């Protein structure tokens, strides 16, 4: 079931795009789960670091991107609302995941 994660909007997940596919990311107690073709399951034990990009320089990007690095590659989740950045970072730090902010 959904974990202890609650978005700024009190929602159990966040809207994001993985490549050209729009969908929902769920931060569950043991894993990150993206529920939209293609479905992506990422256990926290397999995650090396999460990199968050909020504009990579000048101009405030209203929507930020999350790159999840793991032993088999990286997944970039794009178009996440910036208000959801702090709740996601605090939850991932709470789960013992290394968060890097460019």
């Amino acid at each position: 079931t959904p974990g202890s994660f609650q978005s700024q909007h009190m929602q159990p997940g966040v809207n994001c795009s993985l490549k050209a596919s729009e969908g929902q990311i769920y931060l569950l107690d043991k894993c990150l789960f993206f529920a939209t073709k293609p479905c992506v399951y990422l256990p926290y034990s397999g995650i090396i670091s999460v990199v968050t990009s909020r504009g990579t320089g000048q101009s405030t990007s209203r929507t930020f991107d999350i790159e999840v690095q793991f032993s088999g590659g990286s997944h970039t989740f794009a178009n996440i609302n910036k208000d959801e950045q702090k709740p996601i970072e605090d939850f991932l730090k709470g789960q013992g995941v290394r968060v890097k902010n460019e």
């Binding site: 050209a20 729009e22 504009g55 320089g57 990007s61 929507t63």
Partner: protein
Amino acid sequence: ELLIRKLPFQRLVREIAQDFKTDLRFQSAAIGALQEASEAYLVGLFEDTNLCAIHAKRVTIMPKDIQLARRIRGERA
């Protein structure tokens, strides 16, 4: 750091300004502020364009994406 070369932007600004009043002078800080604002605007526009392109299930941004973003913002009628 600013991604446009300074002299081309200054020449463009002077070319544009010369169509409203001849013999105008610009403080260097005015050109710097204009360049900062123009790049910030263009980066925000490119972010919206990227969002539109990803919405259409593509990777390549196209002029129709720019026109749609500018229309939705309320910039083009």
